[PDB]
Amino acid sequence: CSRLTIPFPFVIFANEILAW
Amino acid sequence: KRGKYIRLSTLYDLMTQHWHLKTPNLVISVTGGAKNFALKPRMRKIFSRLIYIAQSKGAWIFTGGTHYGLMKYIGEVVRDNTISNVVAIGIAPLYCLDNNHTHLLLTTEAKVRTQLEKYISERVIPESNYGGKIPIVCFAQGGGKETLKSINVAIKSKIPCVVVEGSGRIADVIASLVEAEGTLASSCVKESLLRFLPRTISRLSEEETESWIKWIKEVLESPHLLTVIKIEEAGDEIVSNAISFALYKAFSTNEHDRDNWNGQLKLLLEWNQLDLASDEIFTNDRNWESADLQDVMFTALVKDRPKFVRLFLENGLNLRKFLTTEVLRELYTNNFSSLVFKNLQIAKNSYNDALLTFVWKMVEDFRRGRHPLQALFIWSVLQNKKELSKVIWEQTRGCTLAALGASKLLKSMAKVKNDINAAGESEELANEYETRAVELFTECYSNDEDLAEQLLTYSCEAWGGSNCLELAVEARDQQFIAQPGVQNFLSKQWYGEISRDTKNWKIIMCLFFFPLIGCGFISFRFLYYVSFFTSPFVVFSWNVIFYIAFLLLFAYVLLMDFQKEPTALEIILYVLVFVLLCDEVRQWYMNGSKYFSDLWNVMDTLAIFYFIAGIVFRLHSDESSWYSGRVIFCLDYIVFTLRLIHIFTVSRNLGPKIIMLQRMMIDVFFFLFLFAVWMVAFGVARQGILRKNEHRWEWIFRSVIYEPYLAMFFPEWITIPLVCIYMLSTNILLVNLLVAMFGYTVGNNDQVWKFQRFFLVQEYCSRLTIPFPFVIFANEILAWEAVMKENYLVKINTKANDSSEEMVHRFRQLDAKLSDLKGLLKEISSKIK
Amino acid sequence: KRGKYIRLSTLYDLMTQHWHLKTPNLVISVTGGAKNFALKPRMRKIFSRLIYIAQSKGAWIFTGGTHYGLMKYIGEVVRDNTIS
Amino acid sequence: QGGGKETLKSINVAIKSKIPCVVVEGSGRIADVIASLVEAEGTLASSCVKESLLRFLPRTISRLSEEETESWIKWIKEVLESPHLLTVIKIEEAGDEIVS
Ligand SMILES: CC(C)CCC[C@@H](C)[C@H]1CC[C@H]2[C@@H]3CC=C4C[C@@H](OC(=O)CCC(=O)O)CC[C@]4(C)[C@H]3CC[C@]12C
Ligand SMILES: Cc1cccc(COc2ccccc2C(=O)N(CCCN)Cc2cccs2)c1
Ligand SMILES: CCCCCCCCCCC
Ligand SMILES: CCCCCCCCCCC
Ligand code: NA
Ligand code: NA
Structure with a gap:
């Protein structure tokens, strides 16, 4: 999941919770 | 952001009409501006359960809205509950204001606070739970003059009950001056209050210190308005055990509700006061007819009081009469949570079974418009009512069946990944309905086996449309099926009418010699042949014996026969293959296009369709396709023998090894698939390197697949990385081989194969009970387990022995005995004076 | 199916000679027509062990034969022991 | 096991007339009374029937006359004339085989 989120042929195209 | 403030020196309408809602409860916390307040782990817990109670009942919490000690802790628990409604109204060298109260109304302030809360106690309410009257409670935990007159002006002026506890300065005083009758104890206020808080008396005059004795002694003029949260109450639900007992005291001592037993019940039902409602209401000196216990029952179901549903049933309430046609539809759309019903949509669509379709349609026809007890049970199972559904289960008629249908309905609603908290709870509840149906059925099987096995196959009167066995295989309830009652049932269904x-061996030798059945050789249970040859152990033994003799005759046809004409041997080879096909088409039902997904049952059909093509090539009369009809018979002879090898493989390892096998079968099929992928890529590499560079046809695409198997059955610098291919292709294929070996291990093991041994034998018993050559020729027990359930519920209830050895009754039964000795010591001193 | 009834305002021979057997034990449960009866888990157990004892010793259990509270519970444990 | 006038004279006409033994237990209205008036010798306890029976069932006394309420004291005290015909299934007997 830390790779690119786009398929192979298209690689060339590219404090409120601490209170909880 | 919010927080409203009003400067102040008639009031109530400016906050219930302009601002917010009505009060079913109202709590008063009085400490005053104590800048210090020792919050223990206990006092942090008492005033955190209290705001959860005000969150549940919807109360107002009047306190002094300044940012010190308790009142800044009460404020910061309120914003903790609005993070995870509560209306904490605040009324107040110099104190700073508290930035956590919802509405602020700022010594000089404790008269408008009293005359407000004395007005809310004055009101008359048409909802009328507490006789109307809006329940007012006043807490107390600390010392000082201000919290002493707050208890005074509560109790003396009107009747709000007051709750104190034994941790503090003067709330410990009144916690000590209530277990004592000394004719108002005219100077024990001085004999208390000095030895437990010695520094406050030497700070003021005597005439006001005696006024504190006048203050305290008029609190104790009514001890029915004074509940004490004692120190030894080391458990949850002790604030509400004190608030409800304070409200029950003030309600029942009105001297008006002697005829109103029902108003005491609805009060004691809203709070979960079971052990108070059993001994103060249902004691048979009070006169109730068990006819007005029905609207109280419908409230005990919807607010999830499971202990009160049980108390209403054991005091006399016919649940069959109560569950009318409209109560179930005031329960499936009015009191059905939409998060479950949205989750019922996803379970019905993504993991669809025959039981869910009856459940999804019976939820719908109640929300759109007869076994009523088993509709209330599904209502309380779908919503994961953990302990209410255990009460309705004991009132159902088919109790082993409904414990399995609930265990399947939850196991399908726990297959939804929409919320893994609700899917983790309902899987846990399903695992204790399967356990509930194991130990009920072993109780039924420790009685006579002919009635318990009458109950396994009960026609259910359309519960879900299935018996207890069908409802346990589809649920994969491995614990219900691995029990010795169900395994003994199947081994009698497989041995048939033979004992x-x-x-x-005695059964097998009667196949080869029919007159041994008519003697006393076999000890089964006038024409015992139709009983012997219908048991599926004999049908399986004859079908394998026929299948070997079919293969020994197909070997004679292939070698000695088969010259040019299909003579009398080969025609009956069709007829023996035809009954191997006629039974397949009559078993081609119930497939769902998934019966053929195992490579040993699609192999059965593809061995005949590759054999029927051998009868096509047989009747062509030319030598160019007669021999092509022999090589398709000889290749099909190996397919028919591998099915015999697979029959011997399964039927020997049908036991503990049936999990190791058939997991290793799909693990070797994956290795042989990866080996076939590698042999294809070895074929392209070997064809591309060798000759015939551009001289090709569809010769290539049919040879490259087979040239490495014919290979199985210039060195400048590339020869050394050719070995690094054989050190990589050996590695990645040997790992797939060893994964196939040891993959059965990784992944209670007795109930895994006992479910599979049950599922395979019941799959074979669901075939025809006639051998291969003869396929062409073709509420009295629910009353019994109601007795068996009550014997079972006695077993699990009297298993509270390690909780009876917890001596919490014996820690307090001598406290009444030592106080029996205590009071007699005191009165004998009064006689000799 | 069964269940015999006699309207009544010397008696014993008309049930040991015409009807059934002799008594090694004889239990008397007296509550009267209490229309309400709080059956706890304990009182459900005391009056279920008792009928098992009368099953073992072969007793007669005289009670008020009306369908209310204990006497309808005593009756329905009796048919539970004739089922098991 | 329960209360009322009828189960009180049933214990009476059992014990007084002939000798069948009587078994009570401590869960009920007046069977809890005689479960409390057997661990006590007070020379027949001439008014402890009033010192019992009121603090543990307070609504049945204010439904009838006094001369029959004193007759209930006459009813209860002739039960206790023979305490060898009065077994109590006590509450702490949390186990099987306590009826027999
Ligand atoms: C030359 C041929 C004709 C003579 C040899 C006969 C055998 C090939 C046949 C007759 C006895 C048969 C067996 C009879 C008993 C067994 C065990 C039986 O397994 C069980 O009993 C499991 C118990 C259960 O499933 O509940 C399954 C069939 C099987 C292997 C049969 C497989 C084939 C057998 C060995
Ligand atoms: C090539 C071919 C095609 C169709 C049928 C056959 C004859 O197959 C049998 C022979 C003897 C006994 C039982 C069978 C037989 O039907 N089984 C094998 C039983 C053991 N796994 C099919 C199955 C039953 C349950 C799951 S699978 C052969
Ligand atoms: C379970 C043992 C069965 C032994 C086989 C019986 C004899 C088969 C051959 C009979 C001709
Ligand atoms: C380049 C070949 C190296 C030898 C391979 C040995 C594999 C043995 C597999 C036995 C399971
Ligand atoms: Na290789
Ligand atoms: Na290899």
């Missing part, structure tokens, strides 16, 4: 005590 299991005859021998194993």
Whole structure:
């Protein structure tokens, strides 16, 4: 999941919770 | 952001009409501006359960809205509950204001606070739970003059009950001056209050210190308005055990509700006061007819009081009469949570079974418009009512069946990944309905086996449309099926009307010699042949014996026969293959296009369709396709023998090894698939390197697949990385081989194969009970387990022995005995004076 | 199916000679027509062990034969022991 | 096991007339009374029937006359004339085989 989120042929195209 | 403030020196309408809602409860916390307040782990817990109670009942919490000690802790628990409604109204060298109260109304302030809360106690309410009257409670935990007159002006002026506890300065005083009758104890206020808070008396005059004795002694003029949260109450639900007992005291001592037993019940039902409602209401000196216990029952179901549903049933309430046609539809759309019903949509669509379709349609026809007890049970199972559904289960008629249908309905609603908290709870509740149906059925099987096995196959009167066995295989309830009652049932369904005590070989030798059945050789249970040859152990033994003789005759046809004409041997080879196909088409039902997904049952059909093509090539009369009809018979002879090898493989390892096998079968099929992928890529590499560079046809695409198997059955610098291919292709294929070996291990093991041994034998018993050559020729027990359930519920209830050895009754039964000795010591001193 | 009834305002021979057997034990449960009866888990157990004892010793259990509270519970444990 | 006038004279006409033994237990209205008036010798306890029976069932006394309420004291005290015909299934007997 830390790779690119786009398929192979298209690689060339590219404090409120601490209170909880 | 919010927080409203009003400067102040008639009031109530400016906050219930302009601002917010009505009060079913109202709590008063009085400490005053104590800048210090020792919050223990206990006092942090008492005033955190209290705001959860005000969150549940919807109360107002009047306190002094300044940012010190308790009142800044009460404020910061309120914003903790609005993070995870509560209306904490605040009324107040110099104190700073508290930035956590919802509405602020700022010594000089404790008269408008009293005359407000004395007005809310004055009101008359048409909802009328507490006789109307809006329940007012006043807490107390600390010392000082201000919290002493707050208890005074509560109790003396009107009747709000007051709750204190034994941790503090003067709330410990009144916690000590209530277990004592000394004719108002005219100077024990001085004999208390000095030895437990010695520094406050030497700070003021005597005439006001005696006024504190006048203050305290008029609190104790009514001890029915004074509940004490004692220190030894080391458990949850002790604030509400004190608030409800304070509200029950003030309600029942009105001297008006002697005829109103029902108003005491609805009060004691809203709070979960079971052990108070049993001994103060249902004691048979009070007169109730068990006819007005029905609207109180419908409230005990919807607010999830499971202990009160049980108390209403055991005091006399016919649940069959109560569950009318409209109560179930005031329950499936009015009191059905939409998060479950949205989750019922996803379970019905993504993991669809025959039981869910009856459940999804019976939820719908109540929300759109007869076994009523089993509709209330599904209502309380779908919503994961953990302990209410255990009460309705004991009132159902088919109790082993409904414990399995609930265990399947939850196991399908726990297959939804929409919320893994609700899917983790309902899987846990399903695992204790399967356990509930194991130990009920072993109780039924420790009685006579002919009635418990009458109950396994009960026609259910359309519960879900299935018996207890069908509802346990589809649920994959491995614990219900691995129990010895169900395994003994199947081994009698497989041995048939033959007894299991005859021998194993004694059955087989009666196949080869029919007149041994008519003697006393076999000990089954006038024409015993139709009983012997219908048991599926004999049908399986004859079908394998026929299948070997079919293969020994197909070997004679292939070698000695088969010259040019299909003579009398080969025609009956069709007829023996035809009954191997006629039974397949009559078993081609119930497939769902998934019966053929195992490579040993699609192999059965593809061995005949590759054999029927051998009868096509047989009747062509030319030598160019007669021999092509022999090589398709000889290749099909190996397919028919591998099915015999697979029959011997399964039927020997049908036991503990049936999990190791058939997991290793799909693990070797994956290795052989990866080996076939590698042999294809070895074929392209070997064809691309060798000759015939551009001289090709569809010769290539049919040879490259087979040239490495014919290979199985210039060195400048590339020869050394050719070995690094054989050190990589050996590695990645040997790992797939060893994964196939040891993959059965990784992944209670007795109930895994006992479910599979049950599922395979019941799959074979669901075939025809006639051998291969003859396929062309073709509420009295629910009353019994109601007795068996009550014997079972006695077993699990009297298993509270390690909780009876917890001596919390014996820690307090001598406290009444030592106080029996205590009071007699005191009165004998009064006589000799 | 069964269940015999006699309207009544010397008696014993008309049930040991015409009807059934002799008594090694004889239990008397007296509550009267209490229309309400709080059956706890304990009182459900005391009056279920008792009928098992009368099953073992072969007793007669005289009670008020009306369908209310204990006497309808005593009756329905009796048919539970004739089922098991 | 329960209360009322009828189960009180049933214990009476059992014990007084002939000798069948009587078994009570401590869960009920007046069977809890005689479960409390057997661990006590007070020379027949001439008014402890009033010192019992009121603090543990307070609504049945204010439904009838006094001369029959004193007759209930006459009813209860002739039960206790023979305490060898009065077994109590006590509450702490949390186990099987306590009826027999
Ligand atoms: C030359 C041929 C004709 C003579 C040899 C006969 C055998 C090939 C046949 C007759 C006895 C048969 C067996 C009879 C008993 C067994 C065990 C039986 O397994 C069980 O009993 C499991 C118990 C259960 O499933 O509940 C399954 C069939 C099987 C292997 C049969 C497989 C084939 C057998 C060995
Ligand atoms: C090539 C071919 C095609 C169709 C049918 C056959 C004859 O197959 C049998 C022979 C003897 C006994 C039982 C069978 C037989 O039907 N089984 C094998 C039983 C053991 N796994 C099919 C199955 C039953 C349950 C799951 S699978 C052969
Ligand atoms: C379970 C043992 C069965 C032994 C086989 C019986 C004899 C088969 C051959 C009979 C001709
Ligand atoms: C380049 C070949 C190296 C030898 C391979 C040995 C594999 C043995 C597999 C036995 C399971
Ligand atoms: Na290789
Ligand atoms: Na290899």
